[PDB]
Every structure is written in C-alpha cells, then in structure tokens.
PDB file of N, CA and C in Angstrom:
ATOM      1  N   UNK A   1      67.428 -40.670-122.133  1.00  0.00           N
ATOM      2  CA  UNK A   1      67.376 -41.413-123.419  1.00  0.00           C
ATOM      3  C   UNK A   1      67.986 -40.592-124.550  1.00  0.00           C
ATOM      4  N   UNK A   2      69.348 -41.129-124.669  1.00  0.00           N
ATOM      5  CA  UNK A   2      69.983 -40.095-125.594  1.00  0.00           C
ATOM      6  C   UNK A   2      70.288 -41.325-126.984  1.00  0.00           C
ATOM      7  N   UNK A   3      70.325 -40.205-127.957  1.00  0.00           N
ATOM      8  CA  UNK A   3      70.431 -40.993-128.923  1.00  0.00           C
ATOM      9  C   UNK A   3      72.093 -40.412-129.659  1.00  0.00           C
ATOM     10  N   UNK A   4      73.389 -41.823-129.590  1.00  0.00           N
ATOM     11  CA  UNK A   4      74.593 -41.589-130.264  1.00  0.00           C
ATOM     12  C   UNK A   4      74.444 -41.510-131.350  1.00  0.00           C
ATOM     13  N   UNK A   5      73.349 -41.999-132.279  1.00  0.00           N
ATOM     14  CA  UNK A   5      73.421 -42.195-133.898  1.00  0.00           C
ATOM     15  C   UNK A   5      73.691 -41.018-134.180  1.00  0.00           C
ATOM     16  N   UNK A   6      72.768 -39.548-134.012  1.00  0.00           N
ATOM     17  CA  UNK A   6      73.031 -38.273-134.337  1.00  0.00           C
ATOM     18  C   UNK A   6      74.368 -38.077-134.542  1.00  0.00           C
ATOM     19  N   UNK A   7      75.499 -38.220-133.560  1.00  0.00           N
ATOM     20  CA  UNK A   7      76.856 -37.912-133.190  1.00  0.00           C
ATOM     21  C   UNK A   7      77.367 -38.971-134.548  1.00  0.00           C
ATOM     22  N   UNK A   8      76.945 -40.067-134.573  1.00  0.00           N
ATOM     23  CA  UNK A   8      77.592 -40.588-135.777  1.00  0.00           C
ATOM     24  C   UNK A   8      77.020 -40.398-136.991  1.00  0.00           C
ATOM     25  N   UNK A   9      76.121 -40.079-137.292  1.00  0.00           N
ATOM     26  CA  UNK A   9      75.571 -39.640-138.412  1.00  0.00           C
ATOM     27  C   UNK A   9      74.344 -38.592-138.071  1.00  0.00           C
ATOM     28  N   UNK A  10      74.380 -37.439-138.501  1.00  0.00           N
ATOM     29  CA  UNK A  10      73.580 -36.139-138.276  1.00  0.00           C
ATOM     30  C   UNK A  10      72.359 -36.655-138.594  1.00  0.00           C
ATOM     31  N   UNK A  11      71.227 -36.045-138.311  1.00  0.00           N
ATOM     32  CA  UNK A  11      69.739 -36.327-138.653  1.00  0.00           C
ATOM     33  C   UNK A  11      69.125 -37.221-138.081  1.00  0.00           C
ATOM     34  N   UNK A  12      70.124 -38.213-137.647  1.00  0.00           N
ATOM     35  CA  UNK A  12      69.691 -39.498-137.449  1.00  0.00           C
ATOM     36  C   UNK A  12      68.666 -39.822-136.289  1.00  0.00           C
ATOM     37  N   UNK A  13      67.432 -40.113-136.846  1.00  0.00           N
ATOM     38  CA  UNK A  13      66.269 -39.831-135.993  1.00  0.00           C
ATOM     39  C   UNK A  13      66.510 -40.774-134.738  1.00  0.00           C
ATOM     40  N   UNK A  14      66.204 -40.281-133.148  1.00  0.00           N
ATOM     41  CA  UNK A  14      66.816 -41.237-132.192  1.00  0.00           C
ATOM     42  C   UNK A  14      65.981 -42.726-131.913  1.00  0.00           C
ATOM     43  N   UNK A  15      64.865 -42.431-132.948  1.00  0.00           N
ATOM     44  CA  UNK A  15      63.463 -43.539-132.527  1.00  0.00           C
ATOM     45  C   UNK A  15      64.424 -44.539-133.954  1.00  0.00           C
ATOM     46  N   UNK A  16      65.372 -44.141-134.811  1.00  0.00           N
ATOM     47  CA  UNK A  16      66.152 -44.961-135.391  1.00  0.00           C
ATOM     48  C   UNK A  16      66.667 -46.062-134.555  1.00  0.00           C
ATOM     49  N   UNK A  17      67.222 -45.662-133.825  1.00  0.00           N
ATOM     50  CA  UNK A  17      67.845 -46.366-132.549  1.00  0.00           C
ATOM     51  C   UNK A  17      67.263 -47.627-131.807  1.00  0.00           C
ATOM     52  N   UNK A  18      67.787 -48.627-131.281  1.00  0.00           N
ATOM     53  CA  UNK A  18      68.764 -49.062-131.793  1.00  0.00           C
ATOM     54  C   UNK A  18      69.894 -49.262-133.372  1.00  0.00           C
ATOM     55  N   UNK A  19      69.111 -49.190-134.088  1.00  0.00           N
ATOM     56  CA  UNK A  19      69.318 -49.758-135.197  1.00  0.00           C
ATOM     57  C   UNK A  19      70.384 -48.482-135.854  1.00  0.00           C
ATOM     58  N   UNK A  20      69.334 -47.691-135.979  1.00  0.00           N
ATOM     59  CA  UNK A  20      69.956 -46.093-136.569  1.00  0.00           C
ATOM     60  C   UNK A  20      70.735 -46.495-138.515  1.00  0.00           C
ATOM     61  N   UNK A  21      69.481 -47.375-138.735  1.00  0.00           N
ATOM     62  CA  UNK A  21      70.245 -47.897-140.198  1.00  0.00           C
ATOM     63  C   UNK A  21      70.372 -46.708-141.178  1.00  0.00           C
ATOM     64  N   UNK A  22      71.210 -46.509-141.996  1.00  0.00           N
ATOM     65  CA  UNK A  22      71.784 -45.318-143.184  1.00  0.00           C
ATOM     66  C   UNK A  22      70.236 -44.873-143.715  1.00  0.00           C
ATOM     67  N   UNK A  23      69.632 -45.705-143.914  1.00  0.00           N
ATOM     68  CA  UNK A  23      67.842 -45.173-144.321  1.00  0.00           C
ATOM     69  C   UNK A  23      66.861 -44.573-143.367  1.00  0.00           C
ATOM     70  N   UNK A  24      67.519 -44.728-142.517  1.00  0.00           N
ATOM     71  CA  UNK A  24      66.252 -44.334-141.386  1.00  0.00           C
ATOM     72  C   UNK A  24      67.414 -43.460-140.904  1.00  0.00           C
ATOM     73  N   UNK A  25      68.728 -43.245-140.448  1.00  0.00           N
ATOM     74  CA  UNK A  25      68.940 -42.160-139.958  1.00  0.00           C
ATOM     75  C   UNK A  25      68.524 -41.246-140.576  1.00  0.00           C
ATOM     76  N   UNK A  26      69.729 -40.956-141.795  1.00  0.00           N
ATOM     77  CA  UNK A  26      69.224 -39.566-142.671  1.00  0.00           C
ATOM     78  C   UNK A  26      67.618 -40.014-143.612  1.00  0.00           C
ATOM     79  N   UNK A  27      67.278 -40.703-143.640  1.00  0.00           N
ATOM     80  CA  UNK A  27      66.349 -40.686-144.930  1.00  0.00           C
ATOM     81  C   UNK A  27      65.286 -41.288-143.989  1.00  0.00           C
ATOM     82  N   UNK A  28      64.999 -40.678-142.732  1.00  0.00           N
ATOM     83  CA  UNK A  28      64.258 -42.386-141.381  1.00  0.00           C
ATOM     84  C   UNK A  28      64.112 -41.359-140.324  1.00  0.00           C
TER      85      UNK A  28
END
C-alpha cells in the first residue's frame, strides 16, 4: 500500500489517498 500523492506532492499524508486533496496532503 503505497501512496503516489507523496511523489506528487511531498507530505502528502497516504491515508489522504485516494483523494490526496491540496488540504489534506500538505495541510491533511
């Protein structure tokens, strides 16, 4: 269970995921 959001946007928490929205990656 890997999460791409990171790779597209740093921080980006993988429980973001699916979604991985700009608020919840870095600010989520």
């Amino acid at each position: 269970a890997q999460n791409p959001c990171s790779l597209q946007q740093p921080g980006c928490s993988s429980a973001c995921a699916p979604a991985c929205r700009l608020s919840c990656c870095s600010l989520g």
